[PDB]
Design a binder for this molecule. Structure first.
Ligand SMILES: NC(=O)c1ccc[n+]([C@@H]2O[C@H](COP(=O)([O-])OP(=O)(O)OC[C@H]3O[C@@H](n4cnc5c(N)ncnc54)[C@H](O)[C@@H]3O)[C@@H](O)[C@H]2O)c1
Ligand SMILES: NC(=O)c1ccc[n+]([C@@H]2O[C@H](COP(=O)([O-])OP(=O)(O)OC[C@H]3O[C@@H](n4cnc5c(N)ncnc54)[C@H](O)[C@@H]3O)[C@@H](O)[C@H]2O)c1
Ligand SMILES: NC(=O)c1ccc[n+]([C@@H]2O[C@H](COP(=O)([O-])OP(=O)(O)OC[C@H]3O[C@@H](n4cnc5c(N)ncnc54)[C@H](O)[C@@H]3O)[C@@H](O)[C@H]2O)c1
Ligand SMILES: NC(=O)c1ccc[n+]([C@@H]2O[C@H](COP(=O)([O-])OP(=O)(O)OC[C@H]3O[C@@H](n4cnc5c(N)ncnc54)[C@H](O)[C@@H]3O)[C@@H](O)[C@H]2O)c1
Lengths: 332, 332, 332, 332
């Protein structure tokens, strides 16, 4: 399968690295599109402020990138419809710019010639939002516009599902203490959200989270029961979802932790990790899990109010899931 | 009343500034004790990384500080019992070192000659823990060892009280996204708490909060119902308490916000502020409130699960309360 | 005189706050143009992450800001030629967008009807670059497109003049340890400068400084003898210029300091401050000086190689100079 | 040879991790002494905020660390004279506590039974200060109390030697933009140095550097010609030395670079690296070099005033040199 990445930013670049690291024979990234030159994309791929140096040899010509001797065409076409997908024989497009999340816009890749599109964020009018650990068995070959939801949703949806199935979720609220992203501002600058307009590394910033409504999409049984928010803090990568749910059946920290441990060893293996050590955010950077269930934080008040917490590398854990979904598509 | 400050650190210094700013005729700070020289204390009082320059003229001799022409004796006596309180005619001592929180240790000031001691943190074996907005009408002249609780407790106890009185609190959990303090570490260094041992400005650090058990002390009706934790983040000052409570009577965001607004205008006036603007942490630095109720964050799920959030300048808001308590003592 | 501010960003906003504080009757700010709406501009004017809350009352309508009952029209015109300067009766325009630095662009404001334009950055094709303390006396009424140079130039040029005057300059190099700005990035993102493309708050970033060339524009005598670079670091505001200069006359630390103190009490009074206390960056935020000579850093080796440093609030010290220049055009 | 590490801090821990990575058979680390317990030392060895997880398996008993099945005894003896070096058969001790820098203190390890002591900082009364790339050939078997100087000295001294060699040095000044360290403070707290007393992560802090004097210890020829200072900034690791030097011979940027590249491919191979890409601090974390010559910063004005810069991972580049010195004593 020939793959194309639209938007070689934080997610687009890490998705490429992961693909390069996996060495899957059936996945060939043939093109990369952004709004800049090959020199700049080469440099940004090579050096990373959070994730260290790219393992491979990176070179560039005026029109392409050369990674370990393989040439990848680079374009700077802000309009997806102008992209030579059809000509390049492009099968799947990873939509990671952040601006083409509506079905109408994403559809432009299919018009330009690609078969399926994966939007690396919550979407509007998509065929399906797939969160591995929740509903990847609903994906069908007829789905062309696919969404992988947000990082916070992947960090907690699989956990919400097991808690619901074991104790029954009545009401619930999550708060994600999240690192800043390129959607924020260095210093106070205009932005649609007046809080995200404020200096990123200087403030504790309450704002919104895609997880709020996305979880109900993958775990329908919980629709209308959960809500949430985000508090962006001065860390460049690494987050933690703090979930408080009112459950139906009585429990204990001991039991909640045991069911989770079971899950991470089984159905959730490699998706949700299990931790019982006093770790901090810098310790989870580079992990591939969608979330790491922190057993040292589990708490129950009155047998029914329970707090559970999930750590996650918002950039890396998520990109891994994007590549998994891409592999899912190789099976149809 | 002649007052003495033991521990001229972040809290000790701000308490002095506030006292200096209030210009209360009946409060004379006659001594300051620490573990350093007058030159260093003079400099630290004068320049502050978070709160700006001290308004007054500060000078120093080998044995004292001279603020606007008034001399304040300075000692470097690590043992409170050796302090010349009796001789100096010291009435009230502000215990702000952080190491004399047990009744036995605090009692040393009374042995050295002072009448009453105010511990600026949760205490052990104290006569009374007073949180203004919750139980300042329990303070009696027979109380010599007084505690003002922690900053997080003052940020939320007054709010917890009104919520309980209006809707009835069943179960509840709070999480405080808190700035780092001098109890943490610049870079990974030994500490009793393995998470607080980690680099302060580089990590999202879950840890403990004094508010967890201190709230039940001032609002007895809620004993055994609330629990909580802290997540220290890379900001030098400014915090927010995120409380999620299961309430008895059905409500709405509209109602919860209205009762709070009423309170801030009444009984809680000047203690708990009310906000409905999209502010961030840097905007609350320098406020005197114990907490600022953020109306833009209030949320209710299923008429009974409610989230309320309180902002606070953990250094300044709290020191103001310490001075208020000191004034309370002038009335007996 | 009627004034308009083009680009209500960090500088644009600070210039206005200063104009408002000075209460100069001969200055009426009648228009403000940016690229966003009034609600956003009102919120950004009211709250600041570094400089705290605006002293006045701020309201807004669909097309104007109302500060203390006075109305300022607000436009969102990215093309200066389409601005109604002629109709608004705009005499002077403060060009602080950062994108209209060459004469061809700056002129669009004149074409639109304004009389004089002050660019808050180095320019190309300007009639004069004026650095108060260096060449303000070269300002002629015929000057129509004026530049105030950059903040680093203003922090060190007046000092360079004096030093050259007293000991004669042979060669010199300056390095400014500079707070980050909005020209930088939150996380690794494309930028012309590949170093400024990197995560601003987590890297020590070598880059360029507009003072490398501009110093000679205002102190012609040192033309071809200086050069410099910048090192952007993780602070939101506050910078320091480290100048190492090879002088002609034999000196001593004492004489350089004495010569500078002399200057700051006379000719450079209110422009360059004098310091001899061990202060750090947070201590100089809010200062009106262009630079604060730090006597504690002065060093001379071989009686001829001298080091001097100048602290400065890159946003606020500079904006005061922008407003000073504006006041100069008032007497013409 | 049996080795003991006194002070398992940033350097102590890194020196050990390197020893462990090199797998040198002639080096057996048999003891580790600090001021805390095994559980804390084990946790701090395992997780690192800057350098990531330890590669091996770490366990602990009440009095020892067990790494990959090997046991290291752990002591908590603040007085080196009371350490059982004689009984443990300790040949060499790595003195990394930062408090036993003078000969009188360092000797307590010899009194306790060790043969040779390597201090990881500038010292007083040492037999020799050795900077590999400068004077390692002056190390004699008779040397018993050795110093590896400071990280800044190691980053620039080898370069100073070469430059002096090729163009002759007349005068020079260095300024290192340095990451903060554990000698600093989280928030304003007493310290000998009134500037280092300030909040480490929120200020640009001028302070001292051990390279101001030490460079001459290893390059005697430049004795009395250099001086320097430090500027501590809000980064956890990564530093850069900015050297402005007045040379004797007329040069050009090209020749200085060529001369340095030459050196790094030969004599300084593996000690000083060569760089010509636009890298930032985060890019040099994890490097083994003492300094990385940055060709993109080299500048010469007047054919004689030259600027050169050297990047370095102050913790890790230095520790590799500490272990290299240790390996040198092996051939004696
Ligand atoms: N950063 C995270 O933690 C994270 C995690 C999960 C999902 N996401 C989502 O993935 C998407 C990408 O976010 P990011 O953090 O990588 O952002 P980013 O801003 O670093 O990357 C956006 C990239 O796309 C490019 N781009 C923008 N418009 C373009 C256009 N019209 N055509 C082609 N290229 C264009 C930009 O130049 C940039 O390089 C967003 O929707 C985001 O919400 C981000
Ligand atoms: N910082 C906050 O947000 C905050 C808020 C509320 C309460 N508190 C509490 O107030 C107390 C002080 O904390 P802080 O943040 O001001 O800390 P700090 O570490 O800045 O201040 C402690 C000061 O006391 C001095 N000291 C320590 N031991 C001494 C001794 N034996 N005798 C005399 N002086 C000694 C230290 O030199 C230092 O100057 C702590 O219990 C803390 O928990 C802190
Ligand atoms: N920040 C400092 O320390 C500093 C100091 C001295 C000078 N300057 C200079 O001042 C200028 C502005 O700097 P800043 O730091 O305030 O930047 P900034 O990005 O905060 O502000 C730029 C503002 O102008 C607006 N703008 C951009 N394009 C526009 C257009 N076409 N029409 C109208 N408005 C538009 C943007 O929305 C933004 O609000 C730059 O030239 C900069 O080099 C900055
Ligand atoms: N951090 C760097 O970049 C760097 C680089 C080169 C050299 N150094 C030098 O290395 C030394 C250690 O520096 P660090 O940054 O690792 O500091 P640090 O504070 O992390 O480590 C010091 C360690 O030694 C322990 N210690 C203190 N007193 C002790 C005693 N009496 N007995 C036994 N152990 C004790 C402390 O518990 C701590 O773990 C200092 O001299 C420093 O100047 C630091």
């Amino acid at each position: 399968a020939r793959v194309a990445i639209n938007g070689f930013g934080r997610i687009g670049r890490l998705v490429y690295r992961i693909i390069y690291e996996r060495k899957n024979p059936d996945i060939e990234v043939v093109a990369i599109n952004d709004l800049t030159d090959t020199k700049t994309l080469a440099h940004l791929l090579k050096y990373d402020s959070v994730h260290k140096k790219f393992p491979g040899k990176v070179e560039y010509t005026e029109n392409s990138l050369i990674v370990d001797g393989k040439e990848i065409k680079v374009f700077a076409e802000p309009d997806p419809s102008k992209l030579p997908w059809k000509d390049l024989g492009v099968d799947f497009v990873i939509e990671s710019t952040g601006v083409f999340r509506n079905r109408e816009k994403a559809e432009l890749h299919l018009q330009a010639g690609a078969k399926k599109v994966i939007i690396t964020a919550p979407a509007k009018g998509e065929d399906i939002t797939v969160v591995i650990g929740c509903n990847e068995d609903q994906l069908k070959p007829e789905h062309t516009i696919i969404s992988c939801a947000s990082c916070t949703t992947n960090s907690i949806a699989p956990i919400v599902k097991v808690l619901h199935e074991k104790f029954g979720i009545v009401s619930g609220m999550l708060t994600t203490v999240h690192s800043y992203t390129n959607d924020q501002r260095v210093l106070d600058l205009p932005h649609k959200d007046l809080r995200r307009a404020r200096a990123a590394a200087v403030n504790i910033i309450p704002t919104t989270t895609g997880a709020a409504k996305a979880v109900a999409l993958v775990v329908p049984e919980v629709k209308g029961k959960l809500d949430g928010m985000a508090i962006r803090v001065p860390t460049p990568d690494g987050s933690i979802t703090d979930l408080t749910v009112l459950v139906e059946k009585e429990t204990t920290v001991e039991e909640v932790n045991a069911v989770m441990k079971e899950a991470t060893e089984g159905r959730l293996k490699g998706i949700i990790g299990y931790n019982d050590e006093p770790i901090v955010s810098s310790d989870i950077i580079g992990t591939t899990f969608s979330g790491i269930f922190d057993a040292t934080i589990t708490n129950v008040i009155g047998g029914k109010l329970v707090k559970v917490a999930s750590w996650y590398d918002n950039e890396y854990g998520y990109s891994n899931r994007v590549v998994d979904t891409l592999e899912l598509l190789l099976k149809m």
